[PDB]
Structure 1
Amino acid sequence: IKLGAGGEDGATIPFGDKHIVFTIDGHTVKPLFFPGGDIGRLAVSGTVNDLAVMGAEPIALANSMIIGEGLDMEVLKRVLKSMDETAREVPVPIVTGDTKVVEDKIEMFVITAGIGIAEHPVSDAGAKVGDAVLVSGTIGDHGIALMSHREGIAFETELKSDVAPIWDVVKAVAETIGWENIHAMKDPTRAGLSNALNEIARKSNVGILVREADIPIRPEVRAASEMLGISPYDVANEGKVVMVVAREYAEEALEAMRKTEKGRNAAIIGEVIADYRGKVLLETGIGGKRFMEPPEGDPVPRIC
């Protein structure tokens, strides 16, 4: 009996004195290449980021690729090059893998599993009342950039995905304020920032009050989101972390992120409260307050 009960969100496994974090995620993004990245960089970044938000230093990645027989070898080579390069940015080795070819008329799916070691585990259940809620950068870039490209929407300054591994951003904060002062984190991928904040609120059993005006959103993302009819708070991010920090260390954490290249646009967007536990309240800039609810469904097709 090795686990947890046999049979059937990264998982944590206590291993003696330390903690092993184990995660897996499939990627079906189409097209395979998008502004700012590709399925290979996405596969590595998403796994590293899921490990990072649990406080785990990535130790190894495993990659499974399922390719259609009609795929051009050059496309495959470019994806592998990108995967290799992205893992080298962490750095974390891709220690094993598998490749299967199918006659099905697909191009490629990439599935990545990762293992990390968290000496000071962090989860979405540890937020405390009074804590500051931070995001490491602009919100909605990935999902909106891909949906925009799909619709032929284009801007003067190209709208690109933010896809990138951000273990370095998380480490920068921990090295400054100490892991003990990072109370919760979430990787705002599927269902975006709103889903991430609701998960922290419900799992930590705390309320979260967000000042809408403080959420960093690029002008192009705001515009494209209006054209697409979707909220940038509800789509996937692939180069960001949501972090809940002890109140007295909020500014230090913000400054630590802003000193990294990927955390340049970090911001404090709200605080944890003792009322409406399990809910996220949004103080709208137009004036007023409303609940920030995860998107009512329709997972944006093949963007991650």
Structure 2
Amino acid sequence: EKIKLEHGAGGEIMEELLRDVILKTLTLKSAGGIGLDALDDGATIPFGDKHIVFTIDGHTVKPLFFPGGDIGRLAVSGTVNDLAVMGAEPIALANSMIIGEGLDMEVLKRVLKSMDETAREVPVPIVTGDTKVVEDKIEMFVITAGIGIAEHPVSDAGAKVGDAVLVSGTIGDHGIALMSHREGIAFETELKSDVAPIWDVVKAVAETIGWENIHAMKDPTRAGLSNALNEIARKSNVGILVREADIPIRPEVRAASEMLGISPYDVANEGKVVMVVAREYAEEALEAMRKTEKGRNAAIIGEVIADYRGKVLLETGIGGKRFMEPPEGDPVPRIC
């Protein structure tokens, strides 16, 4: 048996590898809070009356620079976002770089400058790092770890029947923008990735409704909105009913996705949060998101239900329903 590209594609195939190989081989998996067996966006560790949150992502996106972002902005954003969706204020990042021999020095400078600019948006410092250079023809991989502090960690397993399901903005932008760039699809301008840190969006909701009323979050990265909704449903042992017409999709993204033959629900987003909130606080949460720039296109897209546990239903027309199927993998190679 061999490792396949699908094992790195964020869908069912990767999930099976994590359950059957990673979780079964590693034995020391928790430091006292949310640990590896939870397979959540990060881990938590009790510290005083708060919690340290710890997360890591490798970044292998191609090309290194793309419309709306680059591997540097992605490395900072993705790790800040995994902290944010655990309910953690980012306090420090670590920057590992693995660089291909022969890369132009200006490319490294540009990636670093983008990392710094993006970090400054949060704000969060890059306090430690590492540099390796290999003869392999890889250009560059960037691996960021993050530490945050949460007063009240938010899991991906806390959804409750009756809760509202929100997304912080348009769906499909990153993956569709990336594929469009590769394929020479563009409109008046090129479609831009949404890659950005969204701690500001999460914090805005928390300050409005309180952490206790945010029941679940995930950032819909590899394998998309569909993967994120299916995982929350599965982990929370609930069904999720989504009204398809309420999912925000940029018109240019819809058009390009049609031309590409790719579902915008199944591709990574890089500047979004899926949030599940107490029913009575749904409108306040939505308003809090929409008051921010990065959450300006936020929408309530569905609700948590007691049946179809572990499944996601898509409602269309005047009431019809079908399943939103979780992808076997993100269909966009090297999306991340």
Same fold by TM (over 0.5)? yes
Q: 1:210 to 1:150 in 2, by over 3 A?
A: same
- Aligned mates of 2:254, 2:222 — CA distance in 1: 19
- Deviation at residue 264 of structure 1 after TM alignment: 0.5
State the 1:288 CA deviation: 2.4
Distance apart, 1:285 and its partner CA: 3.9
CA distance in 2, matches of 1:111, 1:57: 20
1:5, CA displacement in angstroms?
Answer: 28
Q: Bigger shift: 291-300 or 262-271?
A: 291-300
Secondary structure in 1 matching 2:51:
strand
Deviation by residue 1:190-236 (Cα, 9 ceiling, x = unmatched): 10000000111011111100000000001111111111111100000
> Of the candidates 263, 276, 287, which is equivalent to residue 319 of structure 2?
287
Which portions of structure 1, spanning 4 or more consecutive aligned residues, are displaced by more than 3 angstroms? 1-9
Deviations 1:97-149 (A, max 9, x none): 00111111121100001111111110111111111100000000001000110
The answer to whether the Cα contact below 8 Å between 1:123 and 1:185 also exists between their aligned partners in 2 is yes
The alpha-carbon deviation at position 6 of structure 1 amounts to 25
Unpaired stretches in structure 2, ≥5 consecutive residues: 12-39
In the alignment, is the contact (CA less than 8 A) between 1:211 and 1:285 conserved in 2? no
User: 2:127 matched to 1:95?
Assistant: yes
Offset at residue 183 of structure 1 (A): 0.7
Q: 1:238 to 1:298 in 2, by over 3 A?
A: closer
Matches within 5 A, 1:96-175: 96-175=128-207
Alignment CA distance shift 1:285-1:235 (3 Å) = farther
Provide the rounded CA distance (Å) in 2 between the counterparts of 1:183 and 1:200: 10
Q: 2:268–2:330: 8 Å Cα contact kept in structure 1?
A: no
CA drift at 1:303: 1.3
Secondary structure class of the residue paired with 2:72: helix
Does the residue aligned with 1:95 lie in a helix, a strand or coil?
A: strand
Could you give the per-residue CA deviations for residues 18-70 of structure 1, whole angstroms, max 9, x where no partner exists? 21111111111111000001000000000000000000111110010011111
Deviations 1:124-179 (A, max 9, x none): 11111111100000000001000110111111243100010000000001111111
Query: How has the CA–CA distance of structure 1 residues 298 and 102 changed in structure 2, closer, same or farther, with 3 Å as cutoff?
Result: same
Instruction: Flag the 1:285–1:74 CA change in 2: closer, same or farther, 3 A.
Output: farther
Displacement of 1:297: 2.9
Q: Identity over aligned residues, as a percent?
A: 100
Deviating more after overlay: 157-166 vs 77-86: 157-166
In 2, Cα distance between equivalents of 1:287 and 1:255: 26
2:9–2:223 contact (8 Å) kept in structure 1: no
User: Could you tell which deviates more after superposition, 155-164 or 137-146?
Assistant: 155-164
Root mean square deviation, CA, Å? 4.4
| 1:29 to 1:281, Cα distance in 2 relative to 1, 3 A | same
CA distance in 2, matches of 1:272, 1:84: 39
8 A Cα contact 1:140 1:233, kept in partner: yes
Distance 1:13 1:2 in 2: 33
Using the TM superposition, give the Cα deviation of residue 17 of structure 1 relative to its aligned residue in structure 2, in angstroms.
2.7
Partners of 1:6 and 1:194 lie apart in 2 by 11
3-12 or 79-88, which moves further after superposition? 3-12
Farther-moved stretch of structure 1 (1-10 vs 285-294):
1-10
Q: Could you tell me the TM-score, scaled by structure 1's length?
A: 0.95
Per-residue deviation, 1:287: 6.2
1:161 and 1:109 map into 2 onto residues whose CA distance is 19
Determine if contact 1:159/1:221 at 8 Å carries over to the other structure: yes
Deviation at 1:284, TM superposition (A): 2.5
CA deviation after TM superposition for structure 1 residue 16, in Å: 4.0
Residue 238 of structure 1: how far off its partner (Å)? 0.4
Does the C-alpha gap of structure 1 residues 282 and 142 become closer, same or farther in structure 2, counting only changes over 3 Å?
same
The CA distance in 1 between the partners of 2:57 and 2:284, in whole Å, is 32
Please list the CA deviations of residues 252-293 of structure 1 after superposition, one character each: whole Å capped at 9, or x if unmatched. 111111000000000000000111111100113486211111
TM-score normalized by the length of structure 2:
0.86
Distance 1:53 1:167 in 2: 8
Question: Does the aligned pair in 1 maintain the 2:93–2:145 contact within 8 Å?
Answer: yes
Deviates more, 1:285-294 or 1:74-83: 285-294
Instruction: Tell me if structure 1 keeps the 8 A contact 2:172–2:253.
Output: yes
